[PDB]
């Protein structure tokens, strides 16, 4: 119940004298103001303008701009004087079971509009968190009231939506932003905000974000206000990510020295930096395909690190798994080095 | 009626935790402004992160409002994060008016001390990020972990990060001597040093084992036998017998050795831990160390999975025996 | 519950064979004057694994979106990982080329495809791939092992590349 | 009431072995703030006898007057599950591992009932009700996390006494709080003395060498030794020097299966061993026990070179069995791989 | 506010690890340049039939075979021939005492076959003979009591009898508990007042609406009295209350158990309880006579179902209904309903089978039962498809769909019928040439071991569709397993996954099919050289044949490769011996079984051995001499042998 007023005035809430919310500073307004996914937005606008709008399924990684996009579509489709009478938005915050489908959804989809005649819109944020039986009712509500109203389901994981609910809709994936067209946003914000940053900072910003603007701006303002300068070292310190030099030294110890000295040095650096074995495995995996290895060596290393990353999940002793990670390289590539 | 030892002699306020210099300094600076930011403590267990955050909560609030204004929660709940989020929502929704007679009114924000934050999947981590953003100016979050790399980018970027380097052996030996003289327990240095050794640099396990020993053998000295059998540590004579049995190359005495270990009620995980700790710090070749360590990792995965102890130890000792006797 | 199954007659419905979905797709197309090529037919049948509802919805979506039925438009609307890319994955792994296979999979991963539909598409292409029976069996076994690893909760690039390495090494090891 | 139950000690001073352990337990309960007790040791070492002894030393004599009650509770998937429980007014003992992977309800809601019952009951003796979860090693990880948060939450109302044969499947935050009670299997002379005391209390006079043979055949399992002594008492009134120790009947079935596999190497014999293993599995004997028995039986016939390979094969397929669901696939596939290894070994 | 979230680290000067540099070794400085150039997909078009089973040619005229079957009514001679054929198939069945009854029952229909062939008399029931005679004797005694009461009333104007006022009937689903109750009531003219779970049955409603059914007479005693008032709220005939599915209690049924306990106490008329839950015999507190319906014999019910087929003028075989009964766990209701649906659809396959022990046989019921006819052509047979070599894409898809349809039920199809499906001889249980023969046996054993290794891989390291041991533990355990279905209207609200069900089903089906194809092909190429060994004079076929039980040869295919009646008698044995008073407190379960049960069996076998020796009588009295109250039937079961 409720829970919309807190967000509704949480978005326009700031100190406006000291706080600097750089994520909330730059927000899209309409379809022409979201400079990304131009094919999807032009397709949706063409569907709207021909009155041939089908049931939409907006899915993808979070922060890519699904909810703001469908809010822009709803505001352009219906004016402000009839927004509340024609648009029904629900999230997973108002979860009371499967009665949400039989409650507001079934009552709203089974009646006409009140004031001005037209087709209504239903927006369902976080539809994958909905249970299987509630979705099995939502597909029937969709099937029998498709002419009067259309449904737009926003989800993060496509696999958690049943095949029938997918098959009643057309699917649109909000893919990650290619780093190129992402970089102009970063240079615009640094040129506006007067921040000292090198190109290694831009590489780190486009690497940790992996195609988003929200966490990118979060990392950028956090590193800027914590240090005053934005570089590779300061970003990976503020984020607390595995530093590239540290992973390079780890690989050097596993690739040059004997078992015991490498083990002691790695354990000392792990307790010095608080660095887990899962992130070591991920970054070493990224490192393996860049360092020129033979095919058999690359295959053996990838198999062993996949096995270790599986063993770490069930909750064994990470000390033994770390020593086995060292063993995975000592078996092949140090033998070849000795050869 | 009484309390366990670990929560009894923890420091009452800030600046009483030794061996830390800048963490307590920044904590005192934040407390003097009466505004604690979102805090992240990472370090190995038994270092004082929980003690530091509890001391900060006691310092900023009043002791009668200390328990009412903090909420301790763990992230390893079996029902997903829905129950955790509903508990955080219930705690943040409820507001308790407070008054301090010491002269400083209580700050409005509430404290959620969340432990084992590094055992958290990325979806749950993003849900916690949006939960913290929902209560940014009403509840300041505390995250306790050993590994900061497991926490994903947004929560790690928005939290004040503090590293806790584990204490040295001399410092924890002195603290355990203070505990022993405070609780009237007859103690030799050798017992406290052996307690430090078997706790593996964790003060919490050392304090727990000391309290367990002084309650198991009341009004008596604390020998090494009780500490060994309470900490679960395998005797070194057993480990050397295992090593000699594998070096012999005979399977029958190997079977006899593991049957003796199993029938003595010795845990297979502890035997694997001690076997690995002896193997990696010996004069074995790197190939032998590599194969033995790979088999140790596979067997430990099998044990955490829940396979049979006797068969797993038989297989690990057979691999060790073949690797050692291959050179012979 | 078992009492209703005792009180009823249990009729079993199977997945529609691709010939049937093709015939009814052709019926709908000839009744709706849809311009098409055979590549679009194969793409629609691929995107709807024995699901007439999904095939009809995808066909209507691409005809309403682009107006012509070929493979490119269908995979622009359905937005699956492209089966030619996954076929080139499997073909490189048959030749035990870990470098090109991981190149294409890094391309797939950087496009935003999740682990779940990536391994699903790998299994779906690998089921009808042209190779030997024993290599198909070992490929299916390793794909299923990696898929249960994705199911249990561990889902990173490392597991995907590890499956790639295992599939490559199944060829170079007797 | 057999000799394993009629003559079971109920006082801490009656335990002839582990006297230092018994004195330590008594001194611990004299303090009155004993923690959760994780008690481990092999089966037949006496863990159940020790926990009944510390229960009797803890509470009054009313812990002998026990009752049997069935509790039925609702799954989160909305299904009703029933489970037996041996309980008393002073303590409650519930096996939680009978619910498959749904042990988390029998961990959590049952502890809720004990907490509300302790809040309702008052006797001015002690401020906790002992909850005994026998066989805690077989609990799932999810159930053990639920167990951990319940001991964190319910510690001031109830005290937990966990009994297991191993702390391998036990997650480490559980062991970080429970007091460890390692009860090793008692030695050969301890079994001989216990058998002598039991036979003297039954009016019989057994020799020392028969008791030593019984202690050596029992493999340091006191309950098996007592039951075999009872069966030998059934066989002959006097304890003769040529008293045949009553061998376990499914054990000699397993030995005959071992002779069946080692004798002939053909898929027909493989199917016959499969049928015998199905017959042995239908007797509700847990699969790891047949795994260990098969290993111990076939390791007599192999040479020293094959033993390590057969051992690693057995451990690998035992782990596959524990991960799997139907034990028959993993077990019989071990039979098949051993059969192939044996056939390719005796051909050269 | 936006205060500084400073990463504070206790970075002391030194330690040689805080401020590190990239390595100077040439391996880690030779970074390969990343390439993003993949092949272009616009040039390569997806050809038809690439990722699917699309073929240019299409079959026409082979399918869409309408049946239009007009079955001629059987004459007396052919019917009598079928009667003698079934009598020779089942020599232990009294087939003459039932055929006038079903012929009278049969003599444009609007009835289900469950009610069309409803048994009017309890003697017309099949199986559970002791139970129905117990019920009939109890109700006859209640009729005698009612007639005696009427005689006493007309004249006016109980430990020795031990007539308890209630029978509680328990058994599996659809064995005919309600059929037995109704048949007895119509045979002796009782009047049933039924309380179902479909009705609102709360305590105040049931007492205020049905107490005077027991406490008083019937106003209508002559005429229409064989009619059944189903209680609901929005010769003389005697009342009889019946509670159908007593174990089903909702939150709306407030205080139902206390109400039927008041009915227990204050009745003067018979009260009958019917439930399929075995645990309700323990939970309910009251005095009642217990009647247990066992699972009926497979051959008797199979003969009765063949018989129902005959009276509808179709002939058939016994084995197909045997496997049909096996698939339904001998459920008579499910089998009768599916038989009605199957017979009234005109039949599946017209194949003639001349048997003496004539129209054409109608075998193929279990194939359509599992939906295998929707996968295969009507010309194709299951075992014919499985024995021959699979080469085409459509045969592969048919194999995968068959295995998938068997994988959702968690049933291993190729595993259970592995003997009858491998290209090897199967028989019922009752020198360089030798080197080559042993090599052939070795190759066959290697193929079998490889296949069973993949099967172990499939169970262990592949996801199953339905999560095994979800509510109980694994099979063959005596903890529990009586997991009754849900009883509350609240929804599950679970967070289970859906994708990893049909994904894992396809994965397991494909892997099982490929592994079995590899194994069968290896066995085939191994025995392709068997002709050379046969020419050499040495025949290893004694070492290659498969010995399988007689009960598994009575079916076309099995869903299980073990014996479940064996497991049922075992589980009954451990549950009955370890429910005795003294041994009811052994808590360590695994220890309890493997220590107490074999020693108890040794004690029982030794006791029988001393009793066969004509020794003293007191040697029988060790079990009673230690106050070990074990019933004699289980002691005799324990004293036989170990299987
Ligand atoms: N393409 C984009 N370019 C720039 N900023 C964007 C873009 N998409 C999203 N944003 C930012 O994200 C804010 C809201 O995006 P959302 O719609 O919440 O993202 P999302 O794809 O819906 O994923 P969620 O909401 O976290 S599940 C906007 O106000 C922007 O600040
Ligand atoms: N430097 C220190 N100064 C004072 N007390 C300390 C110090 N290090 C450890 N302790 C004590 O050691 C005990 C255990 O430490 P805790 O803070 O409770 O746990 P921890 O160090 O956070 O490790 P965890 O919680 O298992 S990750 C407490 O009683 C602390 O007071
Ligand atoms: N032994 C039997 N002999 C003949 N017909 C039977 C037999 N058992 C069941 N039937 C048929 O099955 C129909 C329904 O049986 P029921 O008695 O309703 O099953 P049930 O014992 O009540 O089990 P439930 O109610 O499903 S739990 C009857 O009307 C008969 O047609
Ligand atoms: N001190 C003792 N003296 C004589 N018998 C004992 C003693 N301790 C244990 N026993 C016997 O040994 C058996 C061990 O079984 P149990 O108590 O279940 O241990 P576990 O739980 O380890 O199997 C018990 O039946 C008990 O009768
Ligand atoms: Mg959104
Ligand atoms: Mg803590
Ligand atoms: Mg019924």
Curated annotation (Swiss-Prot), chain A:
Keywords, sorted A to Z: Acetylation, ATP-binding, DNA replication, Nucleotide-binding, Nucleus
Residues with N-acetylmethionine modification: 1
Binding residues for ATP: 60-67
Disulfide bonds: none
GO terms assigned for molecular function: ATP binding; ATP hydrolysis activity; DNA binding; enzyme binding
Any one biological process term the GO annotation gives: DNA-templated DNA replication
Described function: Subunit of the replication factor C (RFC) complex which acts during elongation of primed DNA templates by DNA polymerases delta and epsilon, and is necessary for ATP-dependent loading of proliferating cell nuclear antigen (PCNA) onto primed DNA.
Family statement: Belongs to the activator 1 small subunits family.
NCBIfam families referenced in this protein's UniProt entry, alphabetically: PRK00440.1
Protein name as catalogued: Replication factor C subunit 5
Protein source organism: Homo sapiens
Swiss-Prot record, chain C:
Chain positions found as N6-acetyllysine: 127
Domain of life: Eukaryota
Cellular compartments annotated: Nucleus
Involvement in disease: RFC2 is located in the Williams-Beuren syndrome (WBS) critical region. WBS results from a hemizygous deletion of several genes on chromosome 7q11.23, thought to arise as a consequence of unequal crossing over between highly homologous low-copy repeat sequences flanking the deleted region.
Family affiliation: Belongs to the activator 1 small subunits family.
Annotated function: Subunit of the replication factor C (RFC) complex which acts during elongation of primed DNA templates by DNA polymerases delta and epsilon, and is necessary for ATP-dependent loading of proliferating cell nuclear antigen (PCNA) onto primed DNA. This subunit binds ATP.
Subunit structure: Subunit of the RFC complex, an heteropentameric complex consisting of a large subunit RFC1 and four small subunits RFC2, RFC3, RFC4 and RFC5; the RFC complex interacts with PCNA. Forms an heterotetrameric complex with RFC3, RFC4 and RFC5; this complex has ATPase activity but is not stimulated by PCNA. The heterotetramer of subunits RFC2, RFC3, RFC4 and RFC5 interacts with RAD17. RFC2 also interacts with PRKAR1A; the complex may be involved in cell survival. Interacts with DDX11.
Name by which UniProt lists this protein: Replication factor C subunit 2
Organism: Homo sapiens (Human)
Parent-protein residues present: 178 to 351 of 354
From Swiss-Prot, chain D:
Cellular component annotations (GO), alphabetically ordered: Ctf18 RFC-like complex; DNA replication factor C complex; nucleoplasm; nucleus
Compartments, record wording: Nucleus
Biological function: Subunit of the replication factor C (RFC) complex which acts during elongation of primed DNA templates by DNA polymerases delta and epsilon, and is necessary for ATP-dependent loading of proliferating cell nuclear antigen (PCNA) onto primed DNA.
Record family assignment: Belongs to the activator 1 small subunits family.
Pfam families: DNA_pol3_delta2 (PF13177), RCF1-5-like_lid (PF21960), RFC_C (PF22534)
Annotated GO MF terms: ATP hydrolysis activity; ATP-dependent activity, acting on DNA; DNA binding; DNA clamp loader activity
Entry keywords, A to Z: Acetylation, DNA replication, DNA-binding, Nucleus, Phosphoprotein
First-listed, main subcellular location of the protein, grouped into a coarse class: nucleus
Modified residues (N6-acetyllysine): 19
Signal peptide as annotated in the record: none
InterPro entries: AAA+_ATPase, DNA_pol3_clamp-load_cplx_C, DNA_Rep/Repair_Clamp_Loader, P-loop_NTPase
Assembly with partners or alone: Subunit of the RFC complex, an heteropentameric complex consisting of a large subunit RFC1 and four small subunits RFC2, RFC3, RFC4 and RFC5; the RFC complex interacts with PCNA. Forms an heterotetrameric complex with RFC2, RFC4 and RFC5; this complex has ATPase activity but is not stimulated by PCNA. The heterotetramer of subunits RFC2, RFC3, RFC4 and RFC5 interacts with RAD17. Interacts with CNTD1; this interaction facilitates crossover formation.
The protein, known as: Replication factor C subunit 3
Highest classification ranks of the organism: Eukaryota, Metazoa, Chordata, Craniata, Vertebrata
Curated annotation (Swiss-Prot), chain E:
UniProt binding sites for ATP: 171-178
The protein's name: ATPase family AAA domain-containing protein 5
Impact reported for residue 177 to E: Results in defective PCNA removal from chromatin and recruitment of RAD51 at site of stalled replication forks under replication stress. Loss of processing of stalled replication forks. Retains interaction with PCNA and RFC4
Source organism superkingdom: Eukaryota
Mod. after translation: ATR may stimulate the RAD9A dissociation.
Organism from which the protein derives: Homo sapiens (Human)
Record's subunit section: Component of a heteropentameric replication factor ATAD5 RFC-like complex composed of one large subunit (ATAD5) and four small subunits (RFC2, RFC3, RFC4 and RFC5). Within the ATAD5 RFC-like complex, interacts with RFC2, RFC4 and RFC5. Within the ATAD5 RFC-like complex, interacts directly via-N terminal with RAD51; the interactions is enhanced under replication stress. Interacts with RB1 predominantly in G1 phase via its LXCXE motif. Interacts with RAD9A in growing cells. The interaction with RAD9A is reduced after exposure to DNA replication-inhibiting agents. Interacts with BRD4.
Parent-protein residues present: 866 to 1844 of 1844
Record's subcellular location: Nucleus
Annotated segments matching region Interaction with RAD51 and RFC5: 431-518
Family of this protein: Belongs to the AAA ATPase family.
Phenotype for residue 226 to A: Weakly affects the RAD9A interaction after MMS exposure
């Amino acid at each position: 119940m409720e829970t919309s007023a807190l967000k509704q005035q949480e978005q326009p809430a700031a100190t406006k004298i000291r706080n600097l919310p750089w994520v909330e500073k730059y927000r899209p307004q309409t379809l022409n103001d979201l400079i990304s996914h131009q094919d999807i937005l032009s397709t949706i606008q063409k569907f709207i303008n021909e009155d041939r709008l089908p049931h939409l399924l907006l899915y993808g990684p979070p922060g890519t701009g699904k909810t703001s996009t469908i809010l822009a579509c709803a505001k352009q489709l219906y004016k402000d004087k009839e927004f509340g009478s024609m648009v029904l938005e629900l999230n997973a915050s108002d979860d009371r079971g499967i009665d949400i489908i039989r409650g507001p959804i079934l009552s709203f989809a089974s009646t006409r509009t009140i004031f001005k005649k037209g087709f209504k819109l239903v927006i369902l944020d976080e539809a994958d968190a909905m249970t299987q039986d509630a979705q099995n009712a939502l597909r029937r509500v969709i099937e029998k009231f498709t002419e009067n109203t259309r449904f737009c389901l926003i989800c993060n994981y496509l696999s958690k939506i049943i095949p029938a609910l997918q098959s009643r809709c057309t699917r649109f994936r909000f893919g990650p932003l290619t780093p190129e067209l992402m970089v102009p946003r970063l240079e615009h914000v640094v040129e506006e905000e007067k921040v000292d940053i090198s190109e290694d900072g831009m590489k780190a910003l486009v690497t940790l974000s992996s195609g988003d603007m929200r966490r990118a701006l979060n990392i950028l303002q956090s590193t800027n206000m914590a240090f005053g300068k934005v570089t590779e070292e300061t970003v990976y310190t503020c984020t607390g990510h595995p530093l590239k030099s540290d992973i390079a030294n780890i690989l050097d110890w596993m690739l040059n020295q004997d078992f015991t000295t490498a083990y002691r040095n790695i354990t000392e650096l792990k307790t010095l930096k608080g660095l887990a074995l899962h992130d070591i495995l991920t970054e070493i995996h990224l490192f393996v395909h860049r360092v020129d290895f033979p095919s058999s060596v690359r295959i053996h290393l990838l198999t062993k690190m996949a096995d270790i990353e599986y063993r770490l999940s069930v909750g064994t002793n990470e000390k033994i798994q770390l020593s086995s990670l060292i063993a995975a390289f000592q078996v092949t590539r140090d033998l070849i080095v000795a050869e | 009626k009484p309390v366990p030892w670990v929560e009894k002699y923890r420091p009452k306020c800030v600046d009483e935790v030794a061996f830390q210099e800048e963490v307590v300094a920044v904590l005192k600076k934040s407390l003097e402004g009466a505004d604690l930011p979102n805090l992240l403590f990472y370090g190995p267990p038994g270092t004082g992160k929980t003690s530091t955050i509890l001391a900060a909560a006691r310092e900023l609030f009043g002791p009668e409002l200390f328990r009412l204004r903090v909420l301790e929660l763990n992230a390893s709940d079996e029902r997903g994060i829905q129950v955790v989020r509903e508990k955080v929502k219930n705690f943040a929704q409820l507001t308790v008016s407070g008054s301090r007679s010491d002269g400083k009114p209580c700050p409005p924000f509430k404290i959620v001390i969340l432990d084992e934050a590094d055992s958290m999947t990325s979806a749950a981590q993003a849900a916690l990020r949006r939960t913290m953003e929902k209560e940014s100016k009403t509840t300041r979050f505390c995250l306790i972990c050993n590994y900061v790399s497991r926490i994903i980018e947004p929560l790690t970027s928005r939290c004040s990060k503090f590293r806790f380097k584990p204490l040295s052996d001399k410092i924890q030996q002195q603290r355990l001597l203070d505990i022993a003289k405070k609780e009237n327990v007859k103690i030799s240095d050798e017992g406290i040093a052996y307690l430090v050794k078997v706790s593996e640099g964790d003060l919490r396990k050392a304090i727990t084992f000391l309290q367990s020993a002084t309650r198991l053998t009341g009004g008596k000295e604390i020998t090494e036998k009780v500490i060994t059998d309470i900490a679960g540590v395998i005797p070194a004579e057993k480990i050397d017998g295992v090593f000699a049995a594998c070096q012999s190359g005979s399977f029958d005495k190997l079977e006899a050795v593991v049957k003796d270990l199993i029938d003595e009620g010795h845990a297979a995980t502890q035997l694997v831990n001690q076997l690995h700790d002896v193997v990696v710090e010996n004069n074995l070749s790197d190939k032998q160390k590599s194969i033995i360590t790979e088999k140790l990792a596979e067997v430990d995965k099998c044990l955490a999975d829940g396979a049979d102890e006797h068969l797993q130890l038989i297989s690990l000792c057979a691999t060790v025996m073949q690797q050692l006797s291959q050179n012979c | 519950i078992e009492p209703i199954q005792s009180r009823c007659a249990v009729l079993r419905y199977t997945k529609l064979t691709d010939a049937q979905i093709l015939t009814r797709l052709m019926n709908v197309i000839e009744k709706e004057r849809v311009p098409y090529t055979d590549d679009g037919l194969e793409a629609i049948i691929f995107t709807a694994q024995g699901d007439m509802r999904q095939a009809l919805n995808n066909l209507q979506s691409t005809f309403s979106g682009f107006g012509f039925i070929n493979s490119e438009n269908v995979f622009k609307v359905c937005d699956e990982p492209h089966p030619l890319l996954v076929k080139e994955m499997i073909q490189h792994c048959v030749n035990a080329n870990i470098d090109e296979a991981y190149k294409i999979l890094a391309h797939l991963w950087h496009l935003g495809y999740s682990p779940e539909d990536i391994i699903g598409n790998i299994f779906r292409v690998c089921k009808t791939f042209q190779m030997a029976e024993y290599l198909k069996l070992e490929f299916i076994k390793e794909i299923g092992y990696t898929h249960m690893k994705i199911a249990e909760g561990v889902n990173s690039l490392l597991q995907m590349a590890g499956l790639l390495a295992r599939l490559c090494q199944k060829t170079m090891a007797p | 009431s057999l000799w394993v139950d009629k003559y079971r000690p109920c006082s801490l001073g009656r335990l002839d072995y582990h006297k230092e352990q018994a004195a330590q337990l008594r001194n611990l309960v004299q303090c009155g703030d004993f923690p959760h007790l994780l008690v481990y040791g092999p089966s037949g070492a006496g863990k159940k006898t020790r926990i009944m002894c510390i229960l009797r030393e803890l509470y009054g004599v009313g812990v002998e007057k026990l009752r049997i009650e069935h509790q039925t509770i609702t799954t989160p998937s909305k299904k009703k599950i029933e489970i037996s429980t041996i309980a008393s007014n002073y303590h409650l003992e519930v096996n939680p591992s009978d619910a498959g992977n749904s042990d988390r309800v029998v961990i959590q809601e049952m502890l809720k009932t004990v907490a509300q019952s302790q809040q309702l009951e008052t006797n001015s003796q002690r401020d906790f009700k002992v909850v005994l979860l026998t066989e805690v090693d077989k609990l799932t990880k999810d159930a053990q996390h639920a167990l951990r948060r319940t001991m964190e939450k319910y510690m001031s109302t109830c005290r937990l006494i966990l009994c297991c044969n191993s702390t391998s499947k036990v997650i480490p935050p559980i062991r970080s709080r429970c007091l460890a009670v390692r009860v090793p299997a008692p030695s050969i002379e301890d079994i001989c003395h216990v058998l002598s005391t039991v036979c003297k209390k039954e009016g019989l006079n057994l020799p020392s060498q028969l008791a030593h043979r019984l202690a050596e055949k029992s493999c340091r399992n006191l309950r098996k030794a007592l039951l075999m002594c009872e069966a030998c008492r059934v066989q002959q009134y006097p304890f003769t020097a040529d008293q045949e120790i009553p061998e376990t009947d499914w054990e000699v079935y397993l030995r005959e299966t071992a002779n069946a596999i080692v004798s002939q190497q053909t898929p027909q014999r493989l199917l016959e061993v499969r049928g015998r293993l199905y017959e042995l599995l239908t007797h509700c004997i847990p699969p790891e026990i047949i795994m260990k028995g098969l290993l111990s039986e076939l390791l007599h016939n192999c040479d020293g070179q094959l033993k390590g390979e057969v051992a690693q094969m057995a451990a690998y397929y035992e782990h596959r069995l524990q991960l799997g669901s139907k034990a028959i696939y993993h077990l019989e596939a071990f039979v098949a791989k051993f059969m192939a290894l044996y056939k390719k070994f005796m051909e050269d | 506010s936006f205060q500084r979230v400073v990463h504070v680290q206790q970075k002391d000067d030194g330690c040689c690890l805080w401020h590190l540099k990239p390595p100077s070794c040439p391996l880690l400085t030779k970074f390969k340049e990343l390439n993003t150039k993949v092949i272009d997909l616009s040039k390569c078009g997806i050809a038809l039939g690439e990722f699917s089973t699309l073929n240019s040619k299409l079959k026409s005229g082979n399918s869409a075979a309408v049946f239009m079957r007009t079955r001629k009514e059987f004459t007396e001679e052919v019917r009598n021939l079928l009667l003698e054929e079934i009598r020779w198939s089942n020599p232990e069945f009294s087939l003459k005492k039932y055929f006038p009854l079903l012929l009278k029952k049969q003599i444009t229909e609007d009835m289900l076959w469950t009610e069309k062939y409803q048994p009017q008399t309890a003697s017309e029931l099949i199986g559970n003979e002791l139970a129905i005679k117990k019920l009939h004797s109890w109700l006859k005694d209640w009729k005698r009591r009612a007639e005696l009461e009427e005689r006493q009333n007309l004249k006016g104007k109980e430990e020795e009898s031990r007539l308890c006022n209630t029978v509680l009937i328990t058994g599996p689903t659809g064995v005919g508990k309600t059929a037995a109750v109704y048949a007895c009531a119509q045979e002796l003219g009782f009047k049933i007042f039924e309380v179902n779970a479909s009705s609102q049955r709360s305590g105040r409603q049931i007492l205020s609406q049905l107490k005077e059914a027991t406490q008083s007479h019937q106003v209508d005693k002559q005429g229409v009295n064989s009619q059944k008032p189903c209680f609901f709220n929005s010769k003389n005939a005697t009342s009889l209350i019946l509670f159908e599915e007593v174990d089903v209690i909702f939150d709306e049924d407030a205080g139902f158990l206390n109400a039927i306990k008041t009915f227990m106490a204050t009745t003067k008329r018979p009260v009958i309880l019917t439930t399929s839950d075995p645990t309700f015999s323990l939970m309910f507190d009251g005095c009642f006579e217990e009647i247990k319906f066992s699972t009926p014999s497979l051959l008797n019910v199979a003969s009765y179902l063949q018989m129902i087929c005959l009276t509808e003028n179709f002939r058939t075989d016994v084995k197909d209904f045997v496997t049909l009964l096996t698939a339904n766990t001998c459920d008579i209701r499910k089998s009768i309903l599916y038989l009605q649906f199957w017979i009234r659809s005109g039949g599946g396959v017209l194949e003639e089978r001349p048997l003496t022990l004539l129209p054409k046989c109608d075998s193929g019921c279990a194939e359509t039962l599992f939906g295998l006819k929707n996968i295969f052509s009507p010309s194709e047979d299951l075992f014919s498809f499985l024995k021959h070599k699979i080469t085409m894409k459509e045969e592969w898809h048919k194999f995968i769909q068959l295995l998938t349809e068997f994988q959702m039920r968690n049933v291993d199809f190729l595993y259970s019928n592995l003997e009858f499906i491998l290209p090897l001889p199967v028989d019922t249980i009752p020198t360089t040439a030798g080197k080559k023969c042993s090599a052939l046996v070795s190759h066959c054993l290697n193929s079998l071991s490889e296949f069973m290794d993949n099967m172990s891989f499939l169970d262990a390291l592949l996801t199953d569709v339905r999560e095994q041991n979800k509510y109980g533990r694994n099979d063959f355990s005596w903890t529990n397993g009586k997991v009754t279905s849900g009883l509350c209207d609240e929804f599950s609200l679970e967070s289970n996954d859906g994708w990893t069900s049909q994904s894992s089903g396809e994965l397991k089906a494909a892997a099982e099919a490929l592994s079995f194809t590899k194994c069968s092909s290896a066995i085939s190429k191994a025995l392709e050289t068997l002709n050379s060994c046969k020419k050499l004079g040495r025949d290893p076929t004694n070492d290659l044949t498969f010995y399988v039980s007689q009960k598994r040869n009575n079916v076309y295919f099995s869903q299980s490769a073990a014996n479940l009646d064996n497991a049922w008698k075992r589980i009954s044995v451990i549950k009955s011996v370890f429910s005795s008073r003294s041994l009811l407190y052994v808590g360590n379960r695994q220890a309890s079984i493997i220590e107490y049960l074999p020693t108890l069996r040794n004690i029982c076998k030794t006791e029988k051995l001393k009793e066969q020796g004509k020794s003293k009588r007191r040697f029988l009295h060790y079990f009673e001499g230690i106050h070990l109250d074990i019933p004699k039937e289980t002691v005799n079961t324990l004293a036989a042998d170990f299987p």
